[PDB]
Design a protein around this ligand. Structure first.
Ligand SMILES: Cc1ccnc2c1NC(=O)c1cccnc1N2C1CC1
Lengths: 543, 401
């Protein structure tokens, strides 16, 4: 199975140098195993004898237990130059186009069939304990074998690809999936042309008798040449459940959330709190028994999908499934999905549904460009008016590809709006907050044009925390309308940004007050200046 | 022959990675790339070449033709070092820009440096391994190119310069900058004249420098002022005080002493009126003593004002702007912040070339994912600047509005 394929030039990292590792003096029991092995090997072409000139050497072994050799090239690896990354991204079902037929050739010992850079060839020396040999083909587990093989493979297919453009090949690992639209006899015939072709260059593949049959499993899916399916998975039942046990369940259920709806893992997840060991056994609660059940049913329903049709539009629709959470599906024919997924509640310092929705869209657009090299038409649960309103009031640059409204509650909206101008007849609060940086002691509070005022001492606080506090107070103690003037450009920013979701207790308490009011106008002024009002609170929140 | 070239001490070749491109953009790169192979400009490479730089395709001014574009920003920084920018150009009256990337194809590239230029064409859905190639001649976008080919450049420009000794020609990477003072008719032609002279060796948008300044800050003019009104003015004024330190606000603050209603209209004393007048008069001109330091980097910051507006400022040292301005709209895509921001970036880079002949380090008010997903869909220059993303303050904008 020697190849007539030109070799790829190799070199060791600069400065580095070939291995010169000693050779074990193991028993002649294994020797005779090697002597033979290597001989046929030798006369097979794979290796060749040597002697005086190769001062390099790597430990070689003979193994019994397979009850009927393993060279270790680790040291040669951390010596070899780096090669170009091997395709790391791979095909996803929803990206393929339907076929009449699909076969998968198994490039077996593909590796050992490929020549090794005659030059670099020496460093692969090893001696059989009392014959010196050299490798001549890509060795198992050596740095460059994967990369190099894939390429060589790519070449050998070039002509054939040019001549049979209606044929489609996918190289992966030690596999060649070939599908087409020809007739079942014609298809069978073509495949045999490939075999011979490959056979031509020293790469043997089994025949139609010794093959593998459809469908084929690919990262969760079962693939037919006409459609695909998702094997209904199983959730074992029992009394004993280690933490480890529970973690795994969560994992499986989690991946299925993508494909199946109403999947939940909360109560089942709230079961790892406190755990002291992976071997620990948490008594399955009730809600965690009830939930584990609902999921089992839902998982019994089969799921069928279709492939891609280049002559049709792509279309994605998104849904607000609770705070921070979103669901989407992509199709070309109403009801007939290509792919669907879910995005877990991104949780930040402060955002809103409009901002969140924007990212989901972006992620989906990135995804799409990679599957199809296109971007779908969006259908969204947001008003066109809401979008124009946010677009103008927001500082960051923002955008959404062509889309159209799809009334389908819950819609995504803005939970409150700030006044563009102050309010006539509304109270006016001037708020401040100060905190020491060496003791972290602080004071918050306000004064108004209606005589009233309040202050408040704090502990373990900071400048931005107290500053936000002053505002909460004011919001808290007042009518349905209000004018608020603060000197913290920090707190202005957060709010100016009309946030509706956050991890801070305080920000939320504020967001809540804000949602309540009838009219709110937030205003800013330089700190510590003469500016009346501000110099009152300024004095009260100091000590 | 080929003049040898090397990476700076210690540096190794780029290993950036390929972004995925749309279908339309892949097909085009294949056509384009095959041809260049036939002509021996580029050659398919082996897996033993570990390097890599990203590429993509753009449309130009208006053709249906695409242009290959390679982002050598990185390779350029690692390439060794090797004309004295014409002060004239800026003070000119009309500069037209021409693309000369071609000339580089007629020159061999020292084969030892070639590997470093490797790049990869992607495949949809990863069904196909990418297609790898490395340059055999001088590649567009690279720093070394314009250098290595100058000896020849002047040589060809030799005559036209002599002929017209009052027109300035400055080169930047793949671009040629030509500036005159002629009527915008016999200007447009003198260019073409060159287009042909230039086409005898072998190659193939009117700017207006005289109006690029440091636009002045203004203040509101009011019928009657209210507390809100005054507060706001004090805010902005205070800011500006940093640039013009003689700006005052003691009299305007005095008007607010108390704890009054926000809408309560207040009368201006004769003192406040003065303060205003003076302050207005101090802002009628840019600040004193602001000079370009060439041992420092140009920086460009941009704010979004809304309604299609964007303001910017090119500076080297905080608060001492070398230039400021605003970019808006003219009949195009009615609403696409991304498109606009890209265009804006290009307009600014251009000036930084005309004037100082180098690119500015951008600060973009946007999010990485948004920017990286779409900017290529609207780019148009042979060059690409450096940039970072940020969270714009509130004042900053209010101030420049
Ligand atoms: C696993 C895999 C990866 C990429 N493409 C394919 C396959 N396998 C198939 O069974 C298949 C099914 C439908 C369409 N293309 C397919 N093929 C293509 C080769 C005909």
């Amino acid at each position: 199975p020697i190849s007539p394929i030109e070799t790829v030039p190799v070199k060791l990292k600069p400065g580095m140098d070939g291995p010169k590792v000693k050779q074990w003096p193991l028993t002649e029991e294994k020797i005779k195993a090697l002597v033979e092995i290597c001989t046929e090997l030798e006369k097979e072409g794979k290796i060749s004898k040597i002697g005086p000139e190769n001062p390099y050497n790597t430990p070689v072994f003979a193994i019994k237990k397979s009850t009927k050799k393993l060279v270790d090239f680790r040291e040669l690896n951390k010596r070899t130059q780096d090669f170009w990354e091997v395709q790391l991204g791979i095909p996803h079902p929803a990206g393929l186009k339907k076929k009449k037929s699909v076969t998968v050739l198994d490039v077996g010992d593909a590796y050992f069939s490929v020549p090794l850079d005659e030059d670099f060839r020496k460093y692969t020396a090893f001696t059989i304990p009392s014959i010196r040999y050299q490798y001549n083909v890509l060795p198992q587990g050596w740095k460059g074998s994967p990369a190099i093989f894939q390429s060589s493979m790519t070449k050998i297919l070039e002509p054939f690809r040019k001549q049979n453009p209606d044929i489609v090949i996918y190289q992966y690992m030690d596999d060649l999936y070939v599908g087409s639209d020809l007739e079942i006899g014609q298809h069978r015939t073509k495949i045999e042309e490939l075999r011979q072709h490959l056979l031509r260059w020293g790469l043997y593949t089994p025949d139609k008798k010794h093959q593998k049959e459809p469908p084929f499993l690919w990262m969760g899916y079962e693939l037919h040449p006409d459609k695909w399916t998702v094997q209904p998975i199983v959730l074992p039942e029992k009394d004993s459940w280690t933490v480890n046990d529970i973690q795994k369940l969560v994992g499986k259920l989690n991946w299925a959330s993508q494909i199946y709806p109403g999947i939940k893992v909360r109560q089942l997840c709230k079961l790892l709190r406190g755990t002291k060991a992976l071997t620990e056994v948490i008594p399955l609660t009730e809600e965690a028994e009830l939930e584990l059940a609902e999921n089992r049913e839902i998982l019994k329903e089969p799921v069928h999908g279709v492939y891609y049709d280049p002559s049709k539009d792509l279309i994605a629709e998104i849904q607000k499934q609770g705070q921070g959470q979103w669901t989407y599906q992509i199709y070309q024919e109403p009801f007939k999905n290509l792919k669907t997924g879910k995005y877990a509640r991104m949780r930040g310092a402060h955002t809103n549904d409009v901002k969140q929705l924007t990212e989901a869209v972006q992620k989906i657009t990135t995804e799409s460009i990679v599957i199809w090299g296109k971007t779908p038409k969006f259908k969204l649960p947001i008003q066109k008016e809401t979008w124009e309103t946010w677009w103008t009031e927001y500082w960051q640059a923002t955008w959404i590809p062509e889309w159209e409204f799809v009334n389908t509650p819950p819609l995504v909206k803005l939970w409150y709006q700030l006044e563009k101008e102050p309010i006539v007849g509304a109270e006016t609060f001037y708020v401040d907050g100060a905190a020491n940086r060496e003791t972290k002691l602080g004071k918050a509070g306000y004064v108004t044009n209606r005589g009233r005022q309040k202050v408040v001492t704090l502990t373990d606080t900071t400048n931005q925390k107290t500053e936000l506090q002053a505002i909460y107070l004011a919001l808290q103690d007042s009518g349905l309308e209000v004018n608020i003037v603060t000197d913290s450009q920090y707190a202005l920013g957060i709010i100016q940004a009309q946030p509706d979701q956050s991890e801070s207790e305080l920000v939320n308490q504020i967001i809540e007050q804000l949602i309540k009011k009838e009219k709110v106008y937030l205003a800013w002024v330089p700190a510590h200046k003469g500016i009346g009002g501000n110099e009152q609170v300024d004095k009260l929140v100091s000590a | 022959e080929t003049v040898p070239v090397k990476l700076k001490p210690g540096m190794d070749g780029p290993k950036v990675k390929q972004w995925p491109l749309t279908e339309e953009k892949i097909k085009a790169l294949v056509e384009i790339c095959t041809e260049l192979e036939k002509e021996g400009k580029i050659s398919k490479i082996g897996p033993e070449n570990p390097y890599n730089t990203p590429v993509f395709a753009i449309k130009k001014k208006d053709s249906t033709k695409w242009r290959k574009l390679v982002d050598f920003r990185e390779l350029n920084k690692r390439t060794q070092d090797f004309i004295p920018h014409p002060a004239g150009l800026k003070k000119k009256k009309s500069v037209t820009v021409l693309d000369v990337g071609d000339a580089y194809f007629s020159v061999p590239l020292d084969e030892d440096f070639r590997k470093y230029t490797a790049f990869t064409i992607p495949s949809i859905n990863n069904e196909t391994p990418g297609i790898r190639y490395q340059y055999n001649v001088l590649p567009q976008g690279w720093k070394g190119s314009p250098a290595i080919f100058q000896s020849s450049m002047t040589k060809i420009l030799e005559p036209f310069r002599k002929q017209n000794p009052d027109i300035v020609i400055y080169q930047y990477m793949d671009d040629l900058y030509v500036g005159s003072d002629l009527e915008i008719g016999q200007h447009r032609t003198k260019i073409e004249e060159l287009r042909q002279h230039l086409l005898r060796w072998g190659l193939y948008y009117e700017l207006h420098p005289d109006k690029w300044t440091v636009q002045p800050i203004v203040l509101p003019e009011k019928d009657s002022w209210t507390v809100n009104d005054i507060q706001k003015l004090v805010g902005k004024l205070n800011w500006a005080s940093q640039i013009y330190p003689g700006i005052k606000v003691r009299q305007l603050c005095k008007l607010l002493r108390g704890t009054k209603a926000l809408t309560e209209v207040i009368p201006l004393t004769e003192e406040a009126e003065l303060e205003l007048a003076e302050n207005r008069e101090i802002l009628k001109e840019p600040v004193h003593g602001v000079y370009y330091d060439p041992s420092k980097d140009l920086i460009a910051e941009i704010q979004k004002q809304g309604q299609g507006q964007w303001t910017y400022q090119i500076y080297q040292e905080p608060f001492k702007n070398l230039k400021t301005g605003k970019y808006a709209r003219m009949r195009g895509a009615h609403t696409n912040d991304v498109k606009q921001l890209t265009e804006a970036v290009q307009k600014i880079t251009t000036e930084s070339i005309v004037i100082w002949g180098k690119t500015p380090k951008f600060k973009l008010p946007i999010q990485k994912e948004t920017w990286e997903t779409w900017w290529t869909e609207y780019w148009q220059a042979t060059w690409i600047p450096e940039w970072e993303f940020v969270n714009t303050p509130p004042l900053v904008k209010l101030w420049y509005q």
